[PDB]
Chain A
């Protein structure tokens, strides 16, 4: 499973995709 820091990295990597899904 994700090792917590990896989950934080995944969310950070996703910042711009997340923002643009929030818009749509």
Chain B
């Protein structure tokens, strides 16, 4: 359960600094076959960004991942 979510986070957090950045999210999305504007990527960060620092920490990832 939690090891799967930690693993998914690591796939996005490519530099391992504990924060998914816009550039990292662009990268992952692009290499799954998506063509995204700077606008659409920012929009994706906002799905999870709660403190409004413009990136997704692990805690923010958890709560996006476990709510629907």
Q: Which residues of A contact B (CB under 8 A)?
A: 2-6, 8-10, 12-17
Contact = CB atoms under 8 A, between A and B. Distances in A.
Given A3-B11, A17-B43, A17-B44, A12 B4 contact: no
A12 B11 contact: no
Contact of A13 (B5, B9, B48, B68): B48
Interface of A is mostly: helix
Interface residues of B, number: 22
A6 B64 CA distance: 12
B8 to A, nearest CB: 4
A13 B7 contact: no
B61 interface: yes
Nearest to A10: B32
The 9 A-B residue pairs with the shortest CB-CB distance in the complex, in nearest-first order:
A5-B8, A5-B4, A6-B8, A13-B44, A6-B11, A9-B8, A16-B43, A12-B64, A5-B5
